[PDB]
Design a binder for this molecule. Structure first.
Ligand SMILES: [Mg+2]
Ligand SMILES: [Mg+2]
Ligand SMILES: [Mg+2]
Ligand SMILES: [Mg+2]
Ligand SMILES: [Mg+2]
Ligand SMILES: [Mg+2]
Ligand SMILES: [Mg+2]
Lengths: 41, 94, 97, 140, 107, 55, 67, 155, 166
RNA sequence: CCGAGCCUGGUGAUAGCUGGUUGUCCAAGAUAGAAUCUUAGUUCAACUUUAAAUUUGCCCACAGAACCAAAUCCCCUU
């Protein structure tokens, strides 16, 4: 497919260029900093 | 020697203030502006019966546009181009 | 002054050890071996932590139930105290009820 | 004791380099320094407004000085220049008062003449000719 | 802060632009790495944009050194003995072009 | 489970569902997972439509 | 100039005077600090800006006989 | 302090070409190189060999032309100034301080082949006027007079 | 701890060209771990700062402080090493360039107070540093004259500029 | 430091109470009430926040709201 042709063009897939699907990993909220510290919600 | 009991500008005993000439003039200026406002609102163009429905089409259409946006809210598309573009982070010369 | 005045000794890592070169091997033994084995039994570790995740309270309860008999006396007492404390904390304290 | 902070020094120095020119223990003690570097920056932010205001006041004072040197008063000078339709701002008015005294005397003469023309029109109260320098150039 | 920093007066290098304008940028040195992921934008800038910049600025000597490095950098030497190493580490090609043009327009 | 020009599929779905709605149906096209989402319940009509197209 | 000066109302005619200038530098200002602080409310913000700047050299002022 | 030649990133021919192009002058390359070569460098390298053309002709031509051209400019701008005042102005403009300042900010020191660093002010002045001479031989009296105007009346 | 003075004594200079000033000799000396307070030793050193060697020796010999006696010993042995090892010509041709006292390594001892209270005593130790320079003592800086004051005031008045304008 | 010794353990006792709660930046964001051994708290409601779905939301024209003052409710236009 066109996607596989793009793969042939693109650099090699290794363990160094792997990314999660965007939206799957909601960031952790931890109580540090001005906004989330102090009374920590 | 002369002290106002408690706080100056609150309570039963307050420090008296007096009206200055420029304050009086400021109020008079604003009074003139709003008297002119009275006049220009005192001459109306149409009457209520003559204006009863002259904007219904435009108002309705504007609300329909609002509804169309609020209903067209939806998630965006996703692309092979972006997902495979992330592979360039190891694009080396040689 | 909490900072080293000299560079630390170089940390050379051999990316091609036996262990690194064969990491991940046989992790598909179930779906490539007629489901005779499982990665859960490929796991090696404490007998009470093979193929089971749990939180801290669950881990403590599981360890006490499985290896509590053949456990040192002071460690068992500490585990009992830990379980009691965790029970109180998880069941009576927090922000969401 | 895994995951300790190792660049606390560089953070302390980030604050201290701005604390360096102060007087007392607040030039080297991080707690005392940071409670004053914050107060310094907050003034560096309000001092912008204050600088603008003070510069305008300085211009007004210098313009008043020169105007009184020519026997005129500052309100008269400013108002009559506006009426004459010269839109030089107070900065360049002060610059001319200091560096271009003859040009400033010319400006003061023009403003005085406009004031006299205004007095003449007010006293006449009729439909006399408007006045040579009281004429308004119109734009469309 | 002003009180805690130096200050100077508005000036030119050698009454620049009285008779003619002389570009004050003299040398640009580009330290770039062949294999560093931090040097991707720099590599692409050397690929596509450096030649046209060199043609547009015949009075600037651009040295490009490809060597193993973790932070690609730029050293800006001006006619009056100035020097400006700026990090182009993890910058896009458009950002690097913008920075290089700003260096060219600097005194 | 869509292979090929999912944008062509989007165009076909839009111009087939438009008469049934009046407005153009709101859709999301995902090419990674070759899938197409439409705001609203159109399962029966889309199943019949795909049957009649041959899939 | 010395002994005479011309005043626009408010602008002088372009046939009368030309100012010729030359763009000689395009630079950035030194970093400016915007810090906001409110006490007892944990209010503190810091921002650093660099306004763009242009250095222009005034080359010539020329007048022409047109009065 | 060490000379830019010994500092790492350096290419003499590229530097020469960039010097000419940033000055917007069509120099002749050999003339410019001989206008940067001084006699002290020749003697020092001869000693180093023990362990070609100098500046003199180009420097003298540039110096004489600078005297003549600055004199003409000055006495045409200020016809009521006497010979003493004109000569003193010309000597100030072709003086050591002004010439070395201009040469340093025009990156003549970086390209100067000499024996000592920093380049002695006399050596710098000689090399600057040798550059003037090379420009005179290359472009002509009108263009080099424009150069002289541009870089000394501005001083 | 750090002991850099004793190597400042060991810095060596390249040979001297026959047409430059003679480069007066410098000698560093110090006594470490002196049972005495650094503040008081500072008083003694500030007393003998900038004197001639013999003048300092006399003042110390007739001062009433244990620190004075110790500093006198250090000065005497410094003069000895000066004209024994650093090629100083005349043992009186030396003056005190630097004279400072530094804190030493102390000890903590309890001080029994009343009730059940206690205090921590410090067995104070100090160091003494001295630098001797060959040559007569430099002349003391003369007090400012009214001519100098008026000159400086005039320099300020003539250095005024018109502020915040063109 | 005996209105009930001291030490170890249960024990990380409990505390609607005080104190504390550690990077950067942006945004929305201010308080009708009811119960409660409750009024130093909490639950519901009110207000606030986010994400989704849909269509009306505020201002209001006239007419219309009881016998024994300022105003309000309702409300099409706009
Ligand atoms: Mg805090
Ligand atoms: Mg009071
Ligand atoms: Mg104002
Ligand atoms: Mg507690
Ligand atoms: Mg806000
Ligand atoms: Mg109750
Ligand atoms: Mg309570």
């Amino acid at each position: 497919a066109r996607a596989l042709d793009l793969l042939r063009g693109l650099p090699r897939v290794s363990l160094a260029n792997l990314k999660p699907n965007p939206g799957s990993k909601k960031p952790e909220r931890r109580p540090r900093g001005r906004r989330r510290g102090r009374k920590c919600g | 020697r002369g002290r106002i009991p408690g706080r100056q500008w609150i309570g039963k005993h307050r420090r008296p203030r007096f009206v200055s000439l420029r304050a009086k003039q400021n109020m008079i200026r604003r009074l003139e502006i709003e008297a002119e406002n009275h006049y220009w609102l005192s001459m109306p163009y149409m009457t209520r019966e003559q204006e009863r429905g002259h904007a219904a089409v435009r108002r309705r259409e504007a609300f329909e546009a609002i509804k169309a946006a609020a209903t067209s809210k939806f998630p965006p598309h996703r692309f092979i181009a972006d997902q495979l573009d992330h592979l360039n982070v190891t694009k080396k010369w040689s | 002054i909490g900072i080293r005045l000299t560079l630390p000794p170089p940390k050379v890592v051999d990316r091609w050890n036996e262990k690194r070169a064969m990491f991940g091997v046989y992790d598909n033994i179930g779906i490539l071996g007629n489901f005779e084995k499982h990665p859960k039994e490929l796991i090696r570790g404490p007998i009470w932590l093979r193929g089971w995740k749990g939180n801290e309270l669950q881990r403590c309860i599981r360890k006490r139930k499985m290896v509590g008999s053949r456990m040192f006396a002071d460690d068992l007492h500490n585990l009992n105290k830990r379980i009691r404390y965790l029970y109180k904390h998880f069941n009576r304290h927090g922000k969401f009820r | 004791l895994r995951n300790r902070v190792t660049d606390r020094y560089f953070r302390i120095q980030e604050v201290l380099k701005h604390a360096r020119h102060f007087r007392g223990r607040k030039n080297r003690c991080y707690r005392l320094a940071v409670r004053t570097v914050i107060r310094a920056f907050v003034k560096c932010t309000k001092a912008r407004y204050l600088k603008k205001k003070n510069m305008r006041t300085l211009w007004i004072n210098r313009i008043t000085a020169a105007s009184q040197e020519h026997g005129l008063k500052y309100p008269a000078l400013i108002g009559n220049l506006v009426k004459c339709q010269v839109e030089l701002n107070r900065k360049v008015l002060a610059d001319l008062a200091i560096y271009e005294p003859k040009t400033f005397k010319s400006l003061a003469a023009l403003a005085s003449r406009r004031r006299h023309e205004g007095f003449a029109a007010a006293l006449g109260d009729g439909k006399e000719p408007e006045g040579i320098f009281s004429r308004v150039v119109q734009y469309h | 802060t002003a009180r805690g920093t130096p200050s100077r007066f508005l000036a030119s290098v050698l009454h620049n632009g009285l008779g003619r304008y002389v570009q004050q940028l003299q040398r640009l040195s580009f330290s770039v790495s062949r294999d560093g992921a931090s040097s991707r934008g720099a590599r692409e800038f050397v690929e596509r944009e450096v030649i046209d910049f060199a043609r547009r600025n015949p009075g600037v000597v651009i040295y490009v050194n490809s060597r193993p490095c973790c932070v690609p950098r730029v050293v800006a030497e001006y006619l009056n003995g100035a020097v400006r190493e700026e990090s182009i580490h993890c910058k896009s090609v458009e950002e690097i072009s913008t920075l290089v043009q700003k260096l060219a327009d600097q005194s | 489970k869509v292979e090929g020009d999912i944008w062509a599929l989007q165009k076909d779905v839009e111009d087939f569902l438009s008469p049934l709605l009046g407005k153009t149906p709101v859709t999301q096209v995902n090419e990674v997972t070759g899938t197409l989402r439409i705001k609203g319940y159109f399962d029966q009509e889309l199943k019949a439509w795909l049957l009649e197209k041959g899939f | 100039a010395d002994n005479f000066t011309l005043l626009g109302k408010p602008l002088l005619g372009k046939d009368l005077v030309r100012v010729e200038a030359t763009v000689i530098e395009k630079t950035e200002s030194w970093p400016r600090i915007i810090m906001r602080f409110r006490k007892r409310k944990n209010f503190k913000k810091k921002r650093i800006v660099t306004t763009p700047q242009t250095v222009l050299r005034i080359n010539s002022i020329e007048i022409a006989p047109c009065l | 302090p060490v000379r830019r030649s010994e500092k790492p990133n350096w290419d003499y021919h590229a530097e020469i070409q960039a010097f000419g192009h940033r000055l917007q002058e069509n120099f002749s390359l050999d003339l410019l190189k001989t206008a940067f070569v001084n006699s002290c460098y020749i003697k020092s390298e001869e000693a180093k060999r023990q362990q070609l053309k100098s500046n003199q002709e180009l420097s003298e031509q540039g110096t004489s032309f600078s005297q003549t051209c600055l004199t003409q400019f000055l006495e045409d701008e200020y016809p009521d100034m006497p010979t003493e005042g004109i000569k003193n102005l010309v000597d100030f403009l072709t003086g050591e301080e002004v010439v070395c300042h201009v040469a340093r900010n025009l990156a003549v020191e970086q390209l100067t082949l000499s024996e000592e660093f920093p380049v002695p002010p006399a050596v710098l002045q000689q090399t600057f006027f040798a550059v003037i001479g090379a420009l005179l031989q290359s472009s002509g009296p009108e263009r080099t007079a424009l150069f002289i105007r541009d870089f000394l009346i501005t001083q | 701890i750090s002991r850099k003075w004793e190597k400042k004594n060991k810095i060596v200079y390249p040979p001297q060209l026959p047409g430059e000033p003679r480069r007066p000799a410098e000698i560093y000396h110090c006594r470490r771990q002196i049972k005495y307070s650094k503040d008081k030793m500072w008083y003694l050193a500030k007393l003998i700062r900038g004197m001639s060697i013999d003048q300092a020796l006399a003042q110390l010999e007739f001062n009433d402080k244990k620190g004075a006696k110790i500093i006198k010993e250090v000065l005497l042995e410094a003069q000895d090493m000066a004209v024994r090892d650093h090629n100083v010509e005349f043992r009186s041709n030396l003056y005190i360039a630097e004279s400072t006292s530094g804190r030493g390594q102390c000890l903590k001892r309890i001080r029994y107070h009343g009730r059940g209270r206690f205090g921590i005593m410090e067995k104070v130790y100090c160091h003494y540093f001295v630098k001797l320079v060959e040559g007569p003592p430099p002349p003391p800086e003369p007090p400012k004259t009214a001519v100098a004051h008026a000159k400086e005031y005039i320099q300020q008045l003539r250095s005024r500029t018109i502020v915040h304008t063109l």
